Design an enzyme around this catalytic site. Structure first.
Site, PDB file in Angstrom:
ATOM      1  N   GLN A 156       0.871  -1.221   0.000  1.00  0.00           N
ATOM      2  CA  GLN A 156       0.000   0.000   0.000  1.00  0.00           C
ATOM      3  C   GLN A 156       0.884   1.239   0.000  1.00  0.00           C
ATOM      4  OE1 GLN A 156      -2.654   0.342   3.457  1.00  0.00           O
ATOM      5  NE2 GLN A 156      -2.766   2.578   3.056  1.00  0.00           N
TER       6      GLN A 156
HETATM    7  N1  LIG Z   1      -7.519 -13.414 -10.818  1.00  0.00           N
HETATM    8  C1  LIG Z   1      -6.392 -13.521 -10.112  1.00  0.00           C
HETATM    9  N2  LIG Z   1      -6.360 -13.010  -8.838  1.00  0.00           N
HETATM   10  C2  LIG Z   1      -5.190 -13.123  -8.131  1.00  0.00           C
HETATM   11  C3  LIG Z   1      -4.039 -13.704  -8.652  1.00  0.00           C
HETATM   12  N3  LIG Z   1      -3.071 -13.655  -7.681  1.00  0.00           N
HETATM   13  C4  LIG Z   1      -3.586 -13.068  -6.581  1.00  0.00           C
HETATM   14  N4  LIG Z   1      -4.894 -12.745  -6.845  1.00  0.00           N
HETATM   15  C5  LIG Z   1      -5.880 -12.069  -5.994  1.00  0.00           C
HETATM   16  O1  LIG Z   1      -5.561 -10.687  -5.877  1.00  0.00           O
HETATM   17  C6  LIG Z   1      -5.950 -10.242  -4.579  1.00  0.00           C
HETATM   18  C7  LIG Z   1      -4.735  -9.676  -3.823  1.00  0.00           C
HETATM   19  O2  LIG Z   1      -3.799 -10.719  -3.591  1.00  0.00           O
HETATM   20  P1  LIG Z   1      -2.682 -10.564  -2.412  1.00  0.00           P
HETATM   21  O3  LIG Z   1      -1.815 -11.748  -2.542  1.00  0.00           O
HETATM   22  O4  LIG Z   1      -3.407 -10.280  -1.129  1.00  0.00           O
HETATM   23  O5  LIG Z   1      -1.930  -9.200  -2.883  1.00  0.00           O
HETATM   24  P2  LIG Z   1      -0.646  -8.498  -2.225  1.00  0.00           P
HETATM   25  O6  LIG Z   1       0.356  -8.255  -3.331  1.00  0.00           O
HETATM   26  O7  LIG Z   1      -0.147  -9.378  -1.077  1.00  0.00           O
HETATM   27  O8  LIG Z   1      -1.242  -7.108  -1.649  1.00  0.00           O
HETATM   28  P3  LIG Z   1      -0.567  -6.282  -0.336  1.00  0.00           P
HETATM   29  O9  LIG Z   1      -0.622  -7.200   0.864  1.00  0.00           O
HETATM   30  O10 LIG Z   1      -1.522  -5.113  -0.203  1.00  0.00           O
HETATM   31  O11 LIG Z   1       0.832  -5.860  -0.574  1.00  0.00           O
HETATM   32  C8  LIG Z   1      -6.542 -11.447  -3.854  1.00  0.00           C
HETATM   33  O12 LIG Z   1      -7.950 -11.395  -3.959  1.00  0.00           O
HETATM   34  C9  LIG Z   1      -5.917 -12.619  -4.580  1.00  0.00           C
HETATM   35  O13 LIG Z   1      -6.623 -13.843  -4.523  1.00  0.00           O
HETATM   36  C10 LIG Z   1      -4.086 -14.182  -9.971  1.00  0.00           C
HETATM   37  O14 LIG Z   1      -3.109 -14.698 -10.517  1.00  0.00           O
HETATM   38  N5  LIG Z   1      -5.264 -14.066 -10.672  1.00  0.00           N
END
Ligand SMILES: Nc1nc2c(ncn2[C@@H]2O[C@H](COP(=O)(O)OP(=O)(O)OP(=O)(O)O)[C@@H](O)[C@H]2O)c(=O)[nH]1
Ligand SMILES: [Mg+2]
Ligand code: NA
Lengths: 187, 163
Positions: free
Chosen positions: B56
């Site tokens: 974020q």
């Molecule tokens: N459609 C799709 N959704 C995905 C994919 N990878 C992750 N997501 C989704 O994207 C959203 C965010 O995923 P996170 O892994 O929480 O993202 P992050 O990079 O850790 O985000 P921060 O913790 O804010 O830094 C979730 O709803 C996941 O399930 C993908 O390859 N395809």
């Protein structure tokens, strides 16, 4: 790099291990009802209108000494015949609350160092069991502690927490150094 | 053979999903990460110590405090998020220009390839300005973190390219 922090907590070590660490209040709230965690350091420090802990709190409080954590225990956990003081390594999601909130720190006598997002189990060095208010036992080491993860890391410098102070929008701190450089529009 | 990995990227890119798909072999329900997650995973004889740090905007200033000791950067991009690809470029280059990151090799997970109009690796490479990076190796690996597609292929590239 290798200082420790101390957190009085009523949850026993096996519960903490199962939770993956010392998690913030807001984490369960998010999973249970979708509420986003509040990462305003000021809101964590002030708490609720009534002065209690907010349900969506994104931070986990720790003390800077064993003596101080024991005081927290004897204040907040006075009602518990057994509680624990967790010994925790330093990592860069940790902020010295008085340093970030400066003169506007609402409870500066806390001397709180708070972990944004919680404290993983691997960051926990060990724990003291406190029974009837007395530390009568030696530290129990956490076999899951990973010193190589943390020994090269320190808490976050205050300069990088100012943007997270999260004073209310009309608060005068946003028109002063250092927070002016992170001020919300109109504040 | 250990390598310390820092995994960065904008919020919602899929970083935490990747970490636990690799660690637990499962697709987990995540909370947006405001601090960090850290796990170790062993693959093809390599023990990867992976740091997943929240993306974020308010907490990106904290990324630099994890740079020391980093041997590979994983930078994760949401390939469906065209509105923020330029911001991702800006953040990537801020990371790799830090003196503490100069020697880290760079694996880009071009994530969410399953989504309809998703930008493909060639587009991602161009929009992240990767050819301006001429002093370390880098690679764009398409991935779908939810299904696991591409993730081990990425770790294989890391294995092959650090020495
Ligand atoms: N459609 C799709 N959704 C995905 C994919 N990878 C992750 N997501 C989704 O994207 C959203 C965010 O995923 P996170 O892994 O929480 O993202 P992050 O990079 O850790 O985000 P921060 O913790 O804010 O830094 C979730 O709803 C996941 O399930 C993908 O390859 N395809
Ligand atoms: Mg995350
Ligand atoms: Na430390």
């Amino acid at each position: 790099n290798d200082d420790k922090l101390y957190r009085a907590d009523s949850r026993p070590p096996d519960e903490i291990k199962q939770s993956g660490g010392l998690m913030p209040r807001g984490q369960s709230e998010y999973f249970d009802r979708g509420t986003q965690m509040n990462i305003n350091l000021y809101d964590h420090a002030r708490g609720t209108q009534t002065g209690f802990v907010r349900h969506d709190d994104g931070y986990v409080s720790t003390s800077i000494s064993l003596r101080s954590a024991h005081l927290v225990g004897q204040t907040i956990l006075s009602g518990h015949s057994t509680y624990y003081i967790y010994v925790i390594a330093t990592a860069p999601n940790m902020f010295n609350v008085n340093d970030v909130l400066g003169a506007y720190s609402p409870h500066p006598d806390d001397q709180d160092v708070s972990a944004l997002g919680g404290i993983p189990y691997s960051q926990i060095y060990g724990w003291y069991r406190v029974h009837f208010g007395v530390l009568d036992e030696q530290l129990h080491r956490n076999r899951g502690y990973r010193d190589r993860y943390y020994s090269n890391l320190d808490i976050a410098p205050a300069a990088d927490g100012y943007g997270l102070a999260g004073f209310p929008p009309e608060h005068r701190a946003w028109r002063e150094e250092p927070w002016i450089h992170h001020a919300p529009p109109g504040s | 053979k250990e390598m310390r990995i820092l995994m960065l990227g904008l919020d919602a890119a899929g970083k935490t999903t990747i970490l636990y798909k690799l660690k637990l072999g499962q697709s987990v329900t995540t909370i947006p990460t405001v601090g960090f997650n850290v796990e170790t995973v062993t693959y093809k004889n390599v023990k990867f110590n992976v740091w997943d740090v929240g993306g974020q905007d308010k907490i990106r200033p904290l990324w630099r405090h994890y740079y020391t000791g980093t041997q590979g950067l994983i930078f994760v991009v949401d390939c469906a998020d065209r509105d923020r690809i330029d911001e991702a470029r800006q953040e990537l280059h801020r990371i790799i220009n830090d003196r503490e990151m100069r020697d880290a090799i760079i694996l880009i997970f071009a994530n969410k390839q399953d989504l309809p109009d998703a930008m493909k690796p060639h587009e991602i490479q161009e929009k992240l300005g990767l050819t301006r990076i001429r002093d370390r190796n880098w690679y764009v690996q398409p991935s779908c973190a939810t299904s696991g597609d591409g993730l081990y292929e990425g770790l294989t590239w890391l294995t092959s390219n650090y020495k």
